[PDB]
Ligand binder design. Structure first.
Ligand SMILES: [Cl-]
Ligand SMILES: [Cl-]
Ligand SMILES: [Cl-]
Ligand SMILES: [Cl-]
Ligand SMILES: [Cl-]
Ligand SMILES: [Cl-]
Ligand SMILES: [Cl-]
Ligand SMILES: [K+]
Ligand SMILES: [Mg+2]
Ligand SMILES: [Mg+2]
Ligand SMILES: [Mg+2]
Ligand SMILES: [Mg+2]
Ligand SMILES: [Mg+2]
Ligand SMILES: [Mg+2]
Ligand SMILES: [Mg+2]
Ligand SMILES: [Mg+2]
Ligand SMILES: [Mg+2]
Ligand SMILES: [Mg+2]
Ligand SMILES: [Mg+2]
Ligand SMILES: [Mg+2]
Ligand SMILES: [Mg+2]
Ligand SMILES: [Mg+2]
Ligand SMILES: [Mg+2]
Ligand SMILES: [Mg+2]
Ligand SMILES: [Mg+2]
Ligand SMILES: [Mg+2]
Ligand SMILES: [Mg+2]
Ligand SMILES: [Mg+2]
Ligand SMILES: [Mg+2]
Ligand SMILES: [Mg+2]
Ligand SMILES: [Mg+2]
Ligand SMILES: [Mg+2]
Ligand code: NA
Ligand code: NA
Ligand code: NA
Ligand code: NA
Ligand code: NA
Ligand code: NA
Ligand code: NA
Ligand code: NA
Ligand code: NA
Ligand code: NA
Ligand code: NA
Ligand code: NA
Ligand code: NA
Ligand code: NA
Ligand code: NA
Ligand code: NA
Ligand code: NA
Ligand code: NA
Ligand code: NA
Ligand code: NA
Ligand code: NA
Ligand code: NA
Ligand code: NA
Lengths: 142, 172, 160, 337, 132
RNA sequence: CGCCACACGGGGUAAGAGCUGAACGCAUCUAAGCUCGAAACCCACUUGGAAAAGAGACACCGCCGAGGUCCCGCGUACAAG
RNA sequence: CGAGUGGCUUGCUACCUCGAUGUCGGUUCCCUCCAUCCUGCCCGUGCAGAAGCGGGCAAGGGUGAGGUUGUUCGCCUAUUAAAGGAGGUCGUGAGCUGGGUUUAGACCGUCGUGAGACAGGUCGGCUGCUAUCUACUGGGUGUGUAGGUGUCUGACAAGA
RNA sequence: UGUCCCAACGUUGGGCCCGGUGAACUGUACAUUCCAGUGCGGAGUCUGGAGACACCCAGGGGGAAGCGAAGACCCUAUGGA
RNA sequence: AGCCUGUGUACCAGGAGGGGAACAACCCAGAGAUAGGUUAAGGUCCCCAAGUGUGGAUUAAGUGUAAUCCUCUGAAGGUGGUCUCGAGCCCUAGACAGCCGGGAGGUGAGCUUAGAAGCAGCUACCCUCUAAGAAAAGCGUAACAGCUUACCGGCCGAGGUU
């Protein structure tokens, strides 16, 4: 609890990857970022295929391991980690100064980043993180 | 393109967001009409279906939205009715509406009753060997009717010989 | 054997029968079909089968397709129908096969094939305006028995 | 072509390691159907004897006839629900909110706990009800402990504390039911939760066996024929193929076998009584004499004599309850001979 | 099949030589297969009291000798358990040659028979002198 | 070799069966939408799991004393630990 | 006739290793593929029924015991829901076995003047090493999270 | 008749812990790896990802194309016997 | 064939550095030390220096985001998926489709045939009524009957068809 985020981003109806790309750039810049309403974040494309890719990631693994998240919480963070040199000191510092949350635990409403919004009126082929998570078998806590 | 639908005097149609509600003497039906760049609004006493794009895919849906709304107009006034006839060859089949689901007993001599839950505010009136599915939502009615006919599906044996089962006799 | 082994025109022209011996005969029964006594000009419609890619078609293949095309015309216009089809290409290119591994690998003569440059007419039929849809169907069956893709080009005939 | 064959042993009870708590912990609970009530109890395994029963099964051709049935005797004295823990529904799952305790403590509860000297019950109660009003109240469970002192055969006096859930009608009613039980002194009995004929799920930490080989631990074969005389007798063929170049965790290897938690499903409660009706002549070998509150469980139960075993209303029973079976006879014959 | 009404520890295996408890002319029987049974790798197929086994005639009249017939296991040395707990065991392992209809091939059944076999093979049962 | 226990049911799908429905006035299971439907998938159930670096929660006891180790008699435990 | 997919067979090549990557077959133990033998759900039928036949989805589980033969393969018997095929250095010799191929002894047939040969047959004929690293099965000691006791949570992980 | 179905229990010596004694094999370097890829086509070290807190005890030997022997097979040498 | 064997050439061998995920010969590039600057190949959402650049269009398959290649497959054949460009014919004197109505008489034409009447087969295939309506294109009956097709009219109203 209590994360002194310099920036609070609202992912509701926003394209996950594009938001993720911007959060990484800011975290490496020194900004403490809190991504909010991840369950409501969005990702375009044909649902059936999207789900297939994520279900495969859950299935992939062995003794050494491949921990792939099922909750929208972890999925968004893993998406962001893929955009950071998380194994490097500078990269790990950034990734750890970033946190994703289900819903919005802060008082302030998060800000919608430029170019991340998806016009629901203009789009029918996309999915919500929660929808993916529910399909993965995640316990709907949100 | 743009298509204006004059709403009947008996009807009252209201729309909030992408959901359209159509109210009438026979009841009310609400549907979601969601498609890329097709805006459906209620202008006084005429529903408007329009879009800036005129491509084949868009035209397909605009034509679909039209019929959906018209069918709603018809449902809240005249209503929707499907007729059915229960037919059997050797084993007398008992068909009863129990609770919220039509139940069929002794089908083809089976001990276990076949049942199916009725969709929405659809009514299934039974009088002897005739059934009548009715309601304001064509979606719900048409399905309930189909579910009834499907309930007596037979894959294991020859349909041409074993012809028992309820059947859609009249389609609106 | 697969046509994959002989469909490309990469080897030199090997036609000189004065230096090649033991060449199997052609399986192609006859190049001129239908009413061969009648002339090509005596017909309003002239439809040719045009090979879209430069290739080598083996004699068994030329026979296999010619047959399936003409056999259809015989079935639709009669054994003495009013038409005449022509298979203009002949299998001059002799084919070898190294049937010892790569030692003294020059193959032995196993067959023959026709070299067709893309855009050429393999088959050309002449018919009357009514039987034009039959000749088009004969060609649709014919191009299914040769390596390349083809165009069913209608030459003299603007009766559509 | 080498015949097929299922793998040796199950991959569902791993890792096959020593249990963290000798006292079992259920990871599931029964549904909230009937009236508010505690969803579990505990006792101490004593031993086995057989019982003669009248066929209770309506679908059996033998219905009504004599029938010999193996039974494990478990001393199940009263336990004590010392507190009420409430969980709240958070975005990360359930989390303990607060606890409501008492003042009346068993003389020897401090052998395990740091018993409360200054506690505010009301405040916790209030917090729980406020959370309930907000619609954040998860579930309600009672902290319970046993009275080993009540069981002579069991040497320990140090009580076994475990949390059991309360499944009730409405959240508002079972909350009250819970609070009440606790306020008194939390004293409750097997009668309060179970009735002979019902099926219970018995959880327990199996008899420990230390390290054992693959043959015993995974049920792999022993080397056969000539192979058995070469220098290898109870070692598997190989640790795996050339590739992947690593030993997969799924190959049957040596290790800790025994002393694991197990939850046996659908255990019929043949009879819940009191006294010495079940005790064997000469005493239960390695246990002692049973003269008190007990439960007769059909068949086997995990664990060695003296071990703590937990009960729970079968979460997935196959049969319908056939209450209070007729016991025409209980063997008291010596288990030595 | 129909419940035996008794727990059985199979005492026979494929290849086991048993006694033919009848006047068919076949004296010794050899177990070949166990009807409805499928084992597991390396496991020698097991047969017990109350099973319908396939048999080969080892000894007896030249006529019956070397024939492949079906039979029912009537007795076995290895114990079996009854509902009341008691174990029951015989002095030998024996079977009775049977036809397609499960009717005994012969006319008379030598030696005693298990009661549990009755619930399965009535015609064999109602042909026994003794039923233990 | 003996004895006990080891579901069903939900949810979403495949092939498939359909409903409403347009492009294409009709027709059409599909294009938008919807109802169903596999031993297969997800939940359910069992086992592990605060080293989950966001390294967790609650309750009480305690910071000159709560609690722990050593020691001693022993095992429901155990190759050392 | 034409177009392909696979990489199980066979052939081709001669890239890799001749200061050695231990053979065939078998065994044992583990994972996988689907082009599905059985089982679940389906479509067609030359679908009355019953029994089948052909096809679709589908790899969860299963796919067993024996007689000849070193055999793989295959032939054969009786059971079975069915007794599917294939990959993992033709998985598996710092695991086993050692019947076969292929050392040194010997015989037979064929060939050779002969020594001796054989893509013929046959009898006999050896299986090394105390694990440094890594890998996994289980067991501990520390540090981190930052006083203790007891009770839990559940990111994830395993299951047929 | 435990060769097998199908394994169990037991006995003696080891094995494990303690005192004392006290080698060898092996070692370019680095080295917590796993999945894939690439590369002289059979990589702990290259590339991309995944996983990974350190140390220690026991184990059975999957990998280091493990250790041991300048291949016996095959060819080559204007080699030998 | 990451095959064998020529030939011309440039490269690797013996060639750094930049790009290409890695990678002798593919691209840039031939290179003394140090330093400032500008470009090349290649690249500008993040990882990762530079665009979440501009005008316009297509694609819904995650196609694709893969110059060259053992390495990056994907073919013959098929597609009222969708976009674009053109040609012929029909259309407010009402097209295309759908729905309604009509589809008639001499006559059930002759012949064959027990029978055959649009419709087993053979021949012919005529004329009246009329706004149309075949000596009948397709099912159907033993043959009739019965069911649509041709053809006409009506309703509807804008493009339609090849
Ligand atoms: Cl994993
Ligand atoms: Cl990194
Ligand atoms: Cl869309
Ligand atoms: Cl073995
Ligand atoms: Cl068998
Ligand atoms: Cl130079
Ligand atoms: Cl994707
Ligand atoms: K070598
Ligand atoms: Mg049938
Ligand atoms: Mg040995
Ligand atoms: Mg005893
Ligand atoms: Mg006794
Ligand atoms: Mg075997
Ligand atoms: Mg090796
Ligand atoms: Mg398939
Ligand atoms: Mg599998
Ligand atoms: Mg091998
Ligand atoms: Mg194998
Ligand atoms: Mg090995
Ligand atoms: Mg060896
Ligand atoms: Mg060794
Ligand atoms: Mg040998
Ligand atoms: Mg031999
Ligand atoms: Mg030999
Ligand atoms: Mg790496
Ligand atoms: Mg050498
Ligand atoms: Mg030699
Ligand atoms: Mg010499
Ligand atoms: Mg050189
Ligand atoms: Mg940048
Ligand atoms: Mg792709
Ligand atoms: Mg290319
Ligand atoms: Na996307
Ligand atoms: Na995973
Ligand atoms: Na040669
Ligand atoms: Na072609
Ligand atoms: Na030995
Ligand atoms: Na040995
Ligand atoms: Na090896
Ligand atoms: Na389902
Ligand atoms: Na912690
Ligand atoms: Na291929
Ligand atoms: Na090969
Ligand atoms: Na070497
Ligand atoms: Na082998
Ligand atoms: Na399967
Ligand atoms: Na065999
Ligand atoms: Na190898
Ligand atoms: Na071997
Ligand atoms: Na060996
Ligand atoms: Na022995
Ligand atoms: Na090893
Ligand atoms: Na150079
Ligand atoms: Na590079
Ligand atoms: Na893709």
């Amino acid at each position: 609890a209590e994360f002194d985020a310099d920036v609070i981003v609202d992912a509701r109806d926003c394209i996950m990857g594009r938001v993720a790309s911007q959060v990484a750039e800011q975290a490496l810049d020194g900004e403490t970022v809190a991504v909010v309403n991840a369950e409501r974040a969005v990702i375009t494309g044909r649902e059936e295929q999207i789900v297939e890719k994520y279900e495969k990631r859950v299935d992939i693994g062995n003794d050494n391991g491949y921990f792939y998240p099922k909750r929208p919480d972890g999925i968004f963070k893993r998406t962001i980690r893929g955009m950071l040199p998380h194994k490097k000191q500078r990269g790990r510092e950034a990734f750890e100064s970033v946190r994703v949350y289900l819903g919005n635990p802060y008082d302030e409403d998060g800000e919608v980043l430029d170019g991340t919004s998806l016009d629901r009126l203009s789009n029918i082929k996309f999915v919500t993180l929660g929808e993916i998570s529910e399909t993965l078998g995640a316990n709907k806590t949100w | 393109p743009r298509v204006e639908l004059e709403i009947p005097e008996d009807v009252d149609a209201e729309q909030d967001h992408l959901d359209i509600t159509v109210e009438g003497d026979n009841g009310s039906v609400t549907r979601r009409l969601w498609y890329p760049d097709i805006d459906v609004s209620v202008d006084g006493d005429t529903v408007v279906i329009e879009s800036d794009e005129d491509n084949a895919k868009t035209m397909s849906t605009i034509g679909t939205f039209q019929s959906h709304i018209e069918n709603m107009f018809h449902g809240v006034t005249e209503g929707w009715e499907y007729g059915m006839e229960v037919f059997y060859s050797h084993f007398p089949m008992q068909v009863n509406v129990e609770g919220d689901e039509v139940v069929i007993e002794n089908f083809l001599g089976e001990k276990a009753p076949r049942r199916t839950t009725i969709h929405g505010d659809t009514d299934v009136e039974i009088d002897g060997e005739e059934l009548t599915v009715s309601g304001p939502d064509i979606e719900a009615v048409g399905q309930t009717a189909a579910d009834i006919e499907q309930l007596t599906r037979i894959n294991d044996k020859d349909v041409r010989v074993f012809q028992d089962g309820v059947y859609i006799t009249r389609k609106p | 054997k697969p046509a994959s082994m002989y469909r490309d025109i990469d080897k030199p022209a090997y036609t000189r029968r004065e230096y090649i011996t033991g060449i199997p005969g052609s399986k192609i029964a006859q190049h001129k079909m239908g009413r061969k006594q009648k002339d090509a000009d005596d017909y309003p419609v002239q439809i040719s089968l045009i090979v879209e890619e430069t290739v080598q078609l083996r004699h068994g293949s030329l026979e296999a397709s010619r047959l399936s095309a003409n056999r259809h015309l015989i079935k639709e216009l009669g054994e003495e129908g009013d038409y005449k089809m022509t298979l203009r290409k002949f299998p001059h290119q002799v084919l070898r096969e190294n049937k010892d591994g790569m030692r003294a690998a020059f193959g032995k003569i196993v067959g023959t094939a026709a070299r067709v440059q893309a855009g050429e007419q393999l088959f050309t039929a002449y018919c009357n305006v009514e039987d034009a849809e039959h000749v088009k169907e004969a060609f649709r069956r014919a191009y299914n028995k040769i390596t390349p893709s083809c165009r069913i080009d209608s030459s003299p005939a603007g009766n559509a | 072509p080498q015949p097929s064959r299922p793998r040796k042993g199950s991959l569902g009870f791993g890792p096959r390691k020593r249990s963290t708590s000798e006292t079992p912990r259920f990871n599931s609970w029964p549904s909230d159907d009937g009236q508010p009530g505690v969803q579990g109890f505990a006792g101490y395994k004593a031993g086995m004897t057989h019982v003669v029963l009248v066929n209770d099964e309506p679908n059996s051709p033998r219905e009504g006839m004599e029938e010999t049935v193996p039974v494990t005797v478990i001393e199940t004295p009263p336990m004590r629900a010392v507190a009420l823990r409430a969980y709240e529904d958070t975005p990360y799952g359930q989390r303990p909110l607060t606890e409501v305790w008492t003042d009346e403590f068993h003389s020897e509860l401090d052998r395990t706990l740091d018993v409360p000297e200054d506690h505010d019950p009301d405040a916790a109660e209030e917090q729980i009800r406020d959370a309930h009003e907000a619609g954040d109240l998860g579930d309600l469970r009672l902290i319970t402990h046993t009275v080993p002192d009540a069981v002579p055969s069991v040497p320990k006096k140090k009580p076994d504390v475990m949390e059991t859930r309360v499944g009730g009608g409405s959240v508002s009613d079972r909350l009250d039911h819970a609070l009440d039980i606790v306020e008194d002194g939390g004293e409750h009995a097997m009668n309060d939760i179970f009735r002979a004929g019902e099926y219970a799920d018995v959880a327990g930490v199996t008899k420990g066996k230390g390290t054992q080989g693959p043959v015993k631990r995974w049920g792999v074969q022993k080397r056969k024929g000539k192979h058995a005389r070469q220098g290898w007798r109870r070692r598997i063929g190989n640790l795996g193929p050339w590739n992947p170049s690593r030993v997969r965790s799924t190959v049957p290897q040596q290790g800790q076998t025994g002393y694991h938690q197990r939850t046996e499903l659908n255990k019929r409660l043949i009879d819940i009584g009191e006294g010495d009706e079940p005790t064997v002549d000469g005493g239960f070998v390695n246990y002692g004499e049973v003269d008190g509150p007990y439960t007769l469980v059909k068949g086997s139960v995990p664990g060695p004599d003296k071990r703590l075993v937990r009960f729970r209303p079968a979460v997935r029973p196959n049969d319908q309850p056939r209450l209070d079976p007729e016991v025409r006879y209980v063997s008291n014959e010596s288990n030595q001979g | 099949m129909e419940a035996l009404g008794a727990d059985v520890t199979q005492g026979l295996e494929k290849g086991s030589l048993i006694t033919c408890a009848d006047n068919t002319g076949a004296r010794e029987l050899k177990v070949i297969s166990v009807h409805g049974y499928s084992g597991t790798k390396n496991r020698l197929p097991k047969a017990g009291l109350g099973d319908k086994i396939t048999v080969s005639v080892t000894k007896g009249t030249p006529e019956m000798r070397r024939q492949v017939l079906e039979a029912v296991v009537v007795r076995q040395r290895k114990p079996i358990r009854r509902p009341d707990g008691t174990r029951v065991k015989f002095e030998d392992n024996a079977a009775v040659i049977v036809d397609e209809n499960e009717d005994p091939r012969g006319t008379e059944l030598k030696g005693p028979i298990a009661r549990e076999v009755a619930q399965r093979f009535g015609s064999v049962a109602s042909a026994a002198t003794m039923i233990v």
